[PDB]
Design a protein around this motif. Sequence first.
Motif, PDB file in Angstrom:
ATOM      1  N   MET A   1       0.804  -1.224   0.000  1.00 48.31           N
ATOM      2  CA  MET A   1       0.000   0.000   0.000  1.00 48.31           C
ATOM      3  C   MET A   1       0.831   1.264   0.000  1.00 48.31           C
ATOM      4  SD  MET A   1      -3.520  -1.193   1.857  1.00 48.31           S
ATOM      5  CE  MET A   1      -3.557   0.274   2.848  1.00 48.31           C
ATOM      6  N   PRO A   2       1.757   1.456   0.916  1.00 46.72           N
ATOM      7  CA  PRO A   2       2.612   2.636   0.933  1.00 46.72           C
ATOM      8  C   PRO A   2       3.451   2.735  -0.339  1.00 46.72           C
ATOM      9  CG  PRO A   2       2.690   1.483   3.028  1.00 46.72           C
ATOM     10  CD  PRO A   2       2.090   0.520   2.033  1.00 46.72           C
ATOM     11  N   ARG A   3       3.999   1.628  -0.849  1.00 48.24           N
ATOM     12  CA  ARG A   3       4.811   1.587  -2.056  1.00 48.24           C
ATOM     13  C   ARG A   3       4.049   2.119  -3.261  1.00 48.24           C
ATOM     14  NH1 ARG A   3       3.999  -3.002  -5.363  1.00 48.24           N
ATOM     15  NH2 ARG A   3       5.231  -4.370  -3.969  1.00 48.24           N
ATOM     16  N   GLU A   4       2.833   1.579  -3.402  1.00 48.45           N
ATOM     17  CA  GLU A   4       1.956   2.001  -4.494  1.00 48.45           C
ATOM     18  C   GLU A   4       1.601   3.482  -4.440  1.00 48.45           C
ATOM     19  OE1 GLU A   4       0.843   0.339  -7.373  1.00 48.45           O
ATOM     20  OE2 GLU A   4       2.581  -0.759  -6.636  1.00 48.45           O
ATOM     21  N   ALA A   5       1.367   3.976  -3.223  1.00 42.14           N
ATOM     22  CA  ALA A   5       1.045   5.379  -2.975  1.00 42.14           C
ATOM     23  C   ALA A   5       2.221   6.276  -3.399  1.00 42.14           C
ATOM     24  CB  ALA A   5       0.712   5.603  -1.505  1.00 42.14           C
ATOM     25  N   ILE A   6       3.406   5.844  -2.980  1.00 41.02           N
ATOM     26  CA  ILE A   6       4.644   6.553  -3.303  1.00 41.02           C
ATOM     27  C   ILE A   6       4.835   6.576  -4.818  1.00 41.02           C
ATOM     28  CG2 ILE A   6       7.190   6.525  -3.086  1.00 41.02           C
ATOM     29  CD1 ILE A   6       6.896   5.273  -0.362  1.00 41.02           C
ATOM     30  N   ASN A   7       4.660   5.426  -5.452  1.00 42.74           N
ATOM     31  CA  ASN A   7       4.848   5.324  -6.889  1.00 42.74           C
ATOM     32  C   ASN A   7       3.859   6.129  -7.693  1.00 42.74           C
ATOM     33  OD1 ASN A   7       7.057   3.686  -6.662  1.00 42.74           O
ATOM     34  ND2 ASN A   7       5.964   1.765  -7.020  1.00 42.74           N
ATOM     35  N   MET A   8       2.705   6.463  -7.124  1.00 45.51           N
ATOM     36  CA  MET A   8       1.723   7.239  -7.870  1.00 45.51           C
ATOM     37  C   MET A   8       2.062   8.718  -7.851  1.00 45.51           C
ATOM     38  SD  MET A   8      -2.212   6.313  -8.297  1.00 45.51           S
ATOM     39  CE  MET A   8      -1.672   4.683  -8.768  1.00 45.51           C
ATOM     40  N   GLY A   9       3.036   9.138  -7.074  1.00 47.13           N
ATOM     41  CA  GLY A   9       3.480  10.510  -6.957  1.00 47.13           C
ATOM     42  C   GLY A   9       2.673  11.330  -5.954  1.00 47.13           C
ATOM     43  N   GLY A  10       1.850  10.717  -5.100  1.00 45.31           N
ATOM     44  CA  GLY A  10       1.040  11.441  -4.151  1.00 45.31           C
ATOM     45  C   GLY A  10       1.494  11.537  -2.712  1.00 45.31           C
ATOM     46  N   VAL A  11       2.729  11.182  -2.367  1.00 40.06           N
ATOM     47  CA  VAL A  11       3.237  11.216  -1.000  1.00 40.06           C
ATOM     48  C   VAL A  11       4.178  12.372  -0.688  1.00 40.06           C
ATOM     49  CG1 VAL A  11       4.574   9.803   0.712  1.00 40.06           C
ATOM     50  CG2 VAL A  11       2.847   8.751  -0.717  1.00 40.06           C
ATOM     51  N   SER A  12       3.862  13.224   0.285  1.00 46.02           N
ATOM     52  CA  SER A  12       4.706  14.339   0.660  1.00 46.02           C
ATOM     53  C   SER A  12       5.977  13.824   1.339  1.00 46.02           C
ATOM     54  CB  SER A  12       4.029  15.248   1.678  1.00 46.02           C
ATOM     55  OG  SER A  12       2.790  15.652   1.148  1.00 46.02           O
ATOM     56  N   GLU A  13       5.814  12.872   2.262  1.00 46.26           N
ATOM     57  CA  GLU A  13       6.969  12.310   2.947  1.00 46.26           C
ATOM     58  C   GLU A  13       6.746  10.859   3.380  1.00 46.26           C
ATOM     59  OE1 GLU A  13       7.996  14.279   6.558  1.00 46.26           O
ATOM     60  OE2 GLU A  13       5.906  14.391   7.267  1.00 46.26           O
ATOM     61  N   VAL A  14       7.861  10.148   3.462  1.00 39.34           N
ATOM     62  CA  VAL A  14       7.923   8.735   3.855  1.00 39.34           C
ATOM     63  C   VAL A  14       8.552   8.680   5.234  1.00 39.34           C
ATOM     64  CG1 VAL A  14       8.866   6.460   3.240  1.00 39.34           C
ATOM     65  CG2 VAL A  14       7.982   8.030   1.465  1.00 39.34           C
ATOM     66  N   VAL A  15       7.872   8.112   6.213  1.00 40.47           N
ATOM     67  CA  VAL A  15       8.376   8.075   7.565  1.00 40.47           C
ATOM     68  C   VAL A  15       8.289   6.719   8.250  1.00 40.47           C
ATOM     69  CG1 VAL A  15       7.359  10.431   7.630  1.00 40.47           C
ATOM     70  CG2 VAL A  15       6.422   8.775   9.168  1.00 40.47           C
ATOM     71  N   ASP A  16       9.150   6.510   9.249  1.00 47.56           N
ATOM     72  CA  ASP A  16       9.115   5.266  10.002  1.00 47.56           C
ATOM     73  C   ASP A  16       7.876   5.264  10.883  1.00 47.56           C
ATOM     74  OD1 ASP A  16      10.985   2.952  11.121  1.00 47.56           O
ATOM     75  OD2 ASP A  16      10.022   3.803  12.837  1.00 47.56           O
ATOM     76  N   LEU A  17       7.320   4.094  11.162  1.00 49.74           N
ATOM     77  CA  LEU A  17       6.142   4.011  12.012  1.00 49.74           C
ATOM     78  C   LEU A  17       6.288   4.753  13.336  1.00 49.74           C
ATOM     79  CD1 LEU A  17       3.289   2.703  12.439  1.00 49.74           C
ATOM     80  CD2 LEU A  17       4.479   0.786  13.479  1.00 49.74           C
ATOM     81  N   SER A  18       7.455   4.706  13.977  1.00 51.45           N
ATOM     82  CA  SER A  18       7.636   5.389  15.262  1.00 51.45           C
ATOM     83  C   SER A  18       7.560   6.908  15.195  1.00 51.45           C
ATOM     84  CB  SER A  18       8.964   4.933  15.895  1.00 51.45           C
ATOM     85  OG  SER A  18      10.007   5.393  15.043  1.00 51.45           O
ATOM     86  N   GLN A  19       7.674   7.515  14.023  1.00 49.98           N
ATOM     87  CA  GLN A  19       7.587   8.945  13.816  1.00 49.98           C
ATOM     88  C   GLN A  19       6.298   9.423  13.143  1.00 49.98           C
ATOM     89  OE1 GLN A  19       9.891  12.070  13.874  1.00 49.98           O
ATOM     90  NE2 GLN A  19      10.016  10.900  15.845  1.00 49.98           N
ATOM     91  N   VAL A  20       5.344   8.576  12.760  1.00 55.24           N
ATOM     92  CA  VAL A  20       4.110   9.007  12.111  1.00 55.24           C
ATOM     93  C   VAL A  20       3.235   9.889  12.988  1.00 55.24           C
ATOM     94  CG1 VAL A  20       1.895   8.092  11.119  1.00 55.24           C
ATOM     95  CG2 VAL A  20       4.064   7.074  10.450  1.00 55.24           C
ATOM     96  N   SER A  21       2.948   9.560  14.243  1.00 57.04           N
ATOM     97  CA  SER A  21       2.066  10.399  15.049  1.00 57.04           C
ATOM     98  C   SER A  21       2.673  11.775  15.243  1.00 57.04           C
ATOM     99  CB  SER A  21       1.618   9.742  16.345  1.00 57.04           C
ATOM    100  OG  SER A  21       2.692   9.505  17.220  1.00 57.04           O
ATOM    101  N   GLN A  22       3.983  11.804  15.453  1.00 53.87           N
ATOM    102  CA  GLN A  22       4.673  13.082  15.627  1.00 53.87           C
ATOM    103  C   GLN A  22       4.539  13.917  14.362  1.00 53.87           C
ATOM    104  OE1 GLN A  22       7.081  14.576  17.974  1.00 53.87           O
ATOM    105  NE2 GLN A  22       7.067  16.161  16.356  1.00 53.87           N
ATOM    106  N   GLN A  23       4.798  13.350  13.197  1.00 55.86           N
ATOM    107  CA  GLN A  23       4.727  14.060  11.943  1.00 55.86           C
ATOM    108  C   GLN A  23       3.354  14.536  11.505  1.00 55.86           C
ATOM    109  OE1 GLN A  23       7.419  15.287   9.939  1.00 55.86           O
ATOM    110  NE2 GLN A  23       8.053  14.868  12.087  1.00 55.86           N
ATOM    111  N   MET A  24       2.340  13.692  11.650  1.00 59.70           N
ATOM    112  CA  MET A  24       0.989  14.083  11.262  1.00 59.70           C
ATOM    113  C   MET A  24       0.515  15.221  12.165  1.00 59.70           C
ATOM    114  SD  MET A  24      -1.160  10.807  12.822  1.00 59.70           S
ATOM    115  CE  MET A  24      -1.986  11.001  14.377  1.00 59.70           C
ATOM    116  N   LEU A  25       0.824  15.163  13.462  1.00 59.36           N
ATOM    117  CA  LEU A  25       0.413  16.190  14.413  1.00 59.36           C
ATOM    118  C   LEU A  25       1.171  17.497  14.227  1.00 59.36           C
ATOM    119  CD1 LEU A  25      -0.195  13.988  17.583  1.00 59.36           C
ATOM    120  CD2 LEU A  25      -1.912  15.026  16.071  1.00 59.36           C
ATOM    121  N   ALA A  26       2.466  17.452  13.954  1.00 53.73           N
ATOM    122  CA  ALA A  26       3.237  18.668  13.738  1.00 53.73           C
ATOM    123  C   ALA A  26       2.751  19.368  12.472  1.00 53.73           C
ATOM    124  CB  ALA A  26       4.701  18.269  13.597  1.00 53.73           C
ATOM    125  N   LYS A  27       2.600  18.623  11.379  1.00 57.48           N
ATOM    126  CA  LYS A  27       2.169  19.209  10.104  1.00 57.48           C
ATOM    127  C   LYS A  27       0.744  19.730  10.105  1.00 57.48           C
ATOM    128  CE  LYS A  27       6.054  18.930   7.771  1.00 57.48           C
ATOM    129  NZ  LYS A  27       6.680  19.803   6.721  1.00 57.48           N
TER     130      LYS A  27
END
Length: 198
Positions: free
Chosen positions: A163-189
């Motif tokens: 799922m993430p790979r396909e999303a990335i390949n479609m050109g629609g991902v702003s950033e790729v992050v490790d699972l341990s940093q997702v809550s921090q990143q979604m909340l900061a942004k």
Amino acid sequence: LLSSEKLIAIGASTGGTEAIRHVLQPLPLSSPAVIITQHMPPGFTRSFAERLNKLCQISVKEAEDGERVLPGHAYIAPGDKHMELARSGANYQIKIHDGPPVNRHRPSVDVLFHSVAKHAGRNAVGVILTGMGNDGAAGMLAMYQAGAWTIAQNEASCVVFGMPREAINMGGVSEVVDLSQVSQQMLAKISAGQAIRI
């Protein structure tokens, strides 16, 4: 807290139950609303919501048609039904429908993401986690083109990097992050720029 109402939309499949639990644990009651489409059978989605509710601070529940999307809550799409974000006047709401499966899934991550792109535009953060297939890729591209910040779980931390790979390949991902940093990143942004009231 925020001068505008914002929300987070998450899609996941294989490995997603543990991934989603990891992302939601740190959220306090003041957090923006979280709307999630997890691939799984009907019934399982009610059980998953209850399991998470017992471990999290925020209220977690299986989504119901027409309820308002509230802050400090996480909404799980009901199995064998599609979940969309909708808007009745001044309030964001849940819309449950029995339309055909998309990408052979119902609920479908693409169905969720396309509706968030239409109704929330840049007032949402889209997150795609571990899972098999391409459900969610096109929907995320729609969010990205609508100006939302989009995050994909990285390869190292995924159970299944489909799922993430396909999303990335479609050109629609702003950033790729490790699972341990997702809550921090979604909340900061979601709170960056002029979002916070001062």
